[PDB]
Short mmCIF file of C-alpha atoms in Angstrom, two decimals:
data_model
loop_
_atom_site.label_atom_id
_atom_site.label_comp_id
_atom_site.label_asym_id
_atom_site.label_seq_id
_atom_site.Cartn_x
_atom_site.Cartn_y
_atom_site.Cartn_z
CA UNK A 1 14.11 77.89 77.50
CA UNK A 2 15.56 74.74 75.90
CA UNK A 3 18.81 76.41 74.90
CA UNK A 4 18.72 79.04 77.63
CA UNK A 5 19.17 76.40 80.33
CA UNK A 6 22.57 76.81 81.93
CA UNK A 7 25.29 74.50 83.13
CA UNK A 8 26.83 74.47 86.55
CA UNK A 9 30.25 74.10 84.99
CA UNK A 10 30.77 75.95 81.66
CA UNK A 11 32.42 74.29 78.67
CA UNK A 12 35.94 75.61 77.96
CA UNK A 13 37.37 75.27 74.46
CA UNK A 14 40.89 73.99 74.07
CA UNK A 15 43.22 72.98 71.27
CA UNK A 16 46.69 71.44 71.12
CA UNK A 17 50.09 71.63 69.53
CA UNK A 18 51.17 68.07 68.82
CA UNK A 19 54.74 67.50 69.87
CA UNK A 20 56.17 64.70 67.77
CA UNK A 21 58.75 62.48 69.53
CA UNK A 22 61.25 59.94 68.12
CA UNK A 23 60.70 56.58 69.83
CA UNK A 24 63.89 54.89 68.50
CA UNK A 25 61.53 52.14 67.41
CA UNK A 26 61.41 51.02 63.70
CA UNK A 27 59.90 48.07 61.76
CA UNK A 28 61.38 46.15 58.78
CA UNK A 29 58.59 43.54 58.63
CA UNK A 30 55.17 42.52 59.91
CA UNK A 31 56.44 40.87 63.06
CA UNK A 32 58.59 43.87 64.01
CA UNK A 33 55.59 46.10 63.25
CA UNK A 34 53.56 43.93 65.61
CA UNK A 35 56.15 44.14 68.38
CA UNK A 36 56.33 47.93 67.97
CA UNK A 37 52.58 48.24 68.10
CA UNK A 38 52.62 46.08 71.25
CA UNK A 39 55.38 48.12 72.88
CA UNK A 40 54.20 51.55 71.69
CA UNK A 41 53.02 54.25 74.08
CA UNK A 42 49.45 55.57 73.57
CA UNK A 43 50.92 58.62 71.79
CA UNK A 44 52.27 56.33 69.09
CA UNK A 45 48.92 54.71 68.29
CA UNK A 46 47.17 58.04 68.50
CA UNK A 47 49.64 59.46 66.01
CA UNK A 48 49.55 56.65 63.41
CA UNK A 49 45.82 56.03 63.69
CA UNK A 50 43.80 59.06 64.79
CA UNK A 51 46.18 61.86 63.94
CA UNK A 52 45.42 61.13 60.24
CA UNK A 53 42.19 63.13 60.63
CA UNK A 54 44.35 66.24 60.33
CA UNK A 55 45.06 67.77 56.91
CA UNK A 56 48.82 68.02 57.63
CA UNK A 57 48.96 64.27 58.30
CA UNK A 58 48.94 63.09 54.72
CA UNK A 59 46.28 60.56 54.06
CA UNK A 60 45.47 58.55 51.01
CA UNK A 61 41.82 57.50 50.73
CA UNK A 62 41.29 53.82 51.26
CA UNK A 63 44.05 53.79 53.79
CA UNK A 64 42.62 54.84 57.19
CA UNK A 65 45.95 54.65 59.08
CA UNK A 66 49.74 54.66 58.68
CA UNK A 67 49.99 50.95 59.44
CA UNK A 68 47.58 50.02 56.64
CA UNK A 69 49.34 52.34 54.19
CA UNK A 70 52.75 50.86 55.11
CA UNK A 71 51.64 47.27 54.73
CA UNK A 72 50.07 48.14 51.38
CA UNK A 73 52.70 50.36 49.74
CA UNK A 74 55.91 48.91 51.20
CA UNK A 75 55.03 45.24 51.72
CA UNK A 76 52.62 45.36 48.78
CA UNK A 77 50.14 43.19 50.72
CA UNK A 78 46.64 44.43 49.92
CA UNK A 79 44.34 42.00 51.68
CA UNK A 80 46.14 42.60 54.94
CA UNK A 81 46.26 46.35 54.28
CA UNK A 82 42.46 46.33 53.78
CA UNK A 83 41.95 44.33 56.95
CA UNK A 84 44.05 46.93 58.81
CA UNK A 85 42.19 49.86 57.31
CA UNK A 86 38.90 48.25 58.44
CA UNK A 87 39.42 48.89 62.14
CA UNK A 88 36.72 51.17 63.63
CA UNK A 89 37.61 54.48 65.30
CA UNK A 90 34.05 55.32 66.40
CA UNK A 91 33.18 55.61 70.07
CA UNK A 92 33.75 54.20 72.51
CA UNK A 93 37.05 53.13 70.95
CA UNK A 94 40.23 54.26 72.71
CA UNK A 95 43.88 53.83 71.79
CA UNK A 96 44.04 50.60 73.78
CA UNK A 97 41.03 49.18 71.84
CA UNK A 98 42.78 50.13 68.59
CA UNK A 99 46.15 48.69 69.61
CA UNK A 100 44.39 45.52 70.35
CA UNK A 101 42.34 45.31 67.15
CA UNK A 102 45.56 45.98 65.22
CA UNK A 103 47.42 43.22 67.05
CA UNK A 104 44.43 40.90 66.40
CA UNK A 105 44.67 41.45 62.63
CA UNK A 106 48.54 41.21 62.68
CA UNK A 107 49.25 38.19 64.95
CA UNK A 108 48.10 35.40 62.61
CA UNK A 109 49.63 37.17 59.61
CA UNK A 110 53.06 37.90 61.09
CA UNK A 111 56.21 37.09 59.12
CA UNK A 112 59.78 38.11 58.30
CA UNK A 113 59.27 39.49 54.77
CA UNK A 114 61.27 42.67 54.56
CA UNK A 115 59.90 45.94 53.40
CA UNK A 116 61.53 48.42 51.19
CA UNK A 117 61.30 51.48 53.42
CA UNK A 118 61.05 50.59 57.08
CA UNK A 119 58.29 51.81 59.37
CA UNK A 120 59.24 54.60 61.77
CA UNK A 121 57.25 54.77 65.00
CA UNK A 122 56.60 58.34 66.03
CA UNK A 123 54.67 59.52 69.08
CA UNK A 124 52.39 62.56 69.60
CA UNK A 125 52.08 64.36 72.90
CA UNK A 126 49.46 67.12 72.82
CA UNK A 127 50.33 70.40 74.53
CA UNK A 128 46.92 71.74 75.32
CA UNK A 129 46.00 75.44 75.43
CA UNK A 130 42.81 77.45 75.82
CA UNK A 131 41.31 78.68 72.57
CA UNK A 132 39.35 81.63 73.95
CA UNK A 133 35.77 80.25 74.01
CA UNK A 134 33.55 79.46 77.01
CA UNK A 135 29.93 78.37 76.96
CA UNK A 136 27.55 78.55 79.93
CA UNK A 137 24.37 77.60 78.09
CA UNK A 138 23.27 75.29 75.26
CA UNK A 139 22.76 78.24 72.90
CA UNK A 140 26.17 79.64 73.85
CA UNK A 141 27.55 76.14 73.26
CA UNK A 142 26.12 75.89 69.74
CA UNK A 143 27.46 79.27 68.78
CA UNK A 144 30.83 78.39 70.31
CA UNK A 145 31.32 75.00 68.67
CA UNK A 146 30.41 76.58 65.35
CA UNK A 147 32.88 79.42 66.01
CA UNK A 148 35.70 77.18 67.28
CA UNK A 149 38.77 76.37 65.18
CA UNK A 150 38.54 72.94 63.45
CA UNK A 151 41.56 71.79 65.48
CA UNK A 152 39.77 72.62 68.74
CA UNK A 153 36.79 70.54 67.62
CA UNK A 154 39.23 67.78 66.60
CA UNK A 155 40.88 68.04 69.99
CA UNK A 156 37.61 67.67 71.91
CA UNK A 157 36.07 65.12 69.53
CA UNK A 158 39.10 62.89 68.85
CA UNK A 159 42.22 63.58 70.88
CA UNK A 160 40.50 64.06 74.24
CA UNK A 161 38.38 60.98 73.64
CA UNK A 162 40.81 58.32 72.35
CA UNK A 163 43.81 59.42 74.37
CA UNK A 164 42.56 60.76 77.70
CA UNK A 165 38.92 59.86 77.80
CA UNK A 166 36.99 56.68 78.32
CA UNK A 167 35.99 56.63 74.67
CA UNK A 168 33.42 59.42 74.86
CA UNK A 169 34.15 62.90 73.51
CA UNK A 170 34.08 66.05 75.68
CA UNK A 171 30.99 67.46 73.96
CA UNK A 172 29.03 64.27 74.65
CA UNK A 173 30.24 64.17 78.21
CA UNK A 174 29.34 67.81 78.89
CA UNK A 175 25.88 67.51 77.34
CA UNK A 176 25.02 64.35 79.27
CA UNK A 177 26.51 65.44 82.65
CA UNK A 178 25.07 68.98 82.55
CA UNK A 179 21.83 68.71 80.58
CA UNK A 180 21.40 64.91 80.49
CA UNK A 181 20.97 64.70 76.73
CA UNK A 182 21.78 61.13 75.82
CA UNK A 183 20.43 61.17 72.27
CA UNK A 184 22.85 63.94 71.28
CA UNK A 185 25.72 61.90 72.74
CA UNK A 186 24.47 58.89 70.72
CA UNK A 187 24.17 60.86 67.48
CA UNK A 188 27.74 62.06 68.00
CA UNK A 189 28.86 58.50 68.78
CA UNK A 190 27.81 57.64 65.27
CA UNK A 191 30.69 59.60 63.70
CA UNK A 192 33.79 57.57 62.84
CA UNK A 193 36.53 60.27 62.62
CA UNK A 194 38.96 58.03 60.65
CA UNK A 195 36.49 58.44 57.74
CA UNK A 196 37.63 62.06 57.35
CA UNK A 197 41.05 63.10 56.09
CA UNK A 198 40.45 66.69 57.12
CA UNK A 199 39.52 68.44 60.38
CA UNK A 200 37.21 70.97 58.70
CA UNK A 201 35.16 68.12 57.30
CA UNK A 202 35.10 66.65 60.78
CA UNK A 203 34.01 69.92 62.39
CA UNK A 204 31.27 70.25 59.81
CA UNK A 205 29.90 66.81 60.64
CA UNK A 206 30.03 67.50 64.34
CA UNK A 207 28.33 70.90 64.18
CA UNK A 208 25.63 69.52 61.85
CA UNK A 209 24.93 66.66 64.24
CA UNK A 210 24.67 69.05 67.21
CA UNK A 211 22.40 71.50 65.41
CA UNK A 212 20.22 68.62 64.33
CA UNK A 213 20.07 67.22 67.87
CA UNK A 214 19.60 70.51 69.81
CA UNK A 215 17.92 73.02 67.53
CA UNK A 216 15.78 69.89 67.23
#
């Protein structure tokens, strides 16, 4: 049937432990922050921008990333903070796209005003492991993604996409490659992950979208 159709290559569910590395980089002001954003490895941008989707990464609403929060709380510059929070993390945005949008907002605004508490650049490297779910068919896939841990769904929907991928999540890629379902990939591509502060929220949105697209 629709959902009984099978894929050549099954979908394997993975998750990650995020190893957080000290980069020896730190910012006292907007220009230093800009230089650090320019010089940062992808793990740094992923951490301060996308990693906020996790509950552990503490996120205040109305700040969508660490940089925005810092500029707002420490430099007490709101208009700039808002600008910085307004960057889109929806597909097909990758960490390079983000770095670059950030730098675009920062360049004109750069100065030497010193902040209170300086910004510490930290990097994430994911150590990926198998979760224990495979899916051969669409039906299997739906059951799986609904059974998967929230962090697995975050991994496949955010981490794999912005860090490794081309700016398309693993679900989307698997659906299109195997079953050629472009609409479902589109529907997914409509979710901006930065909008959630919590990976369970995120997983809920994702599963809903898939059920909507496939079961329909």
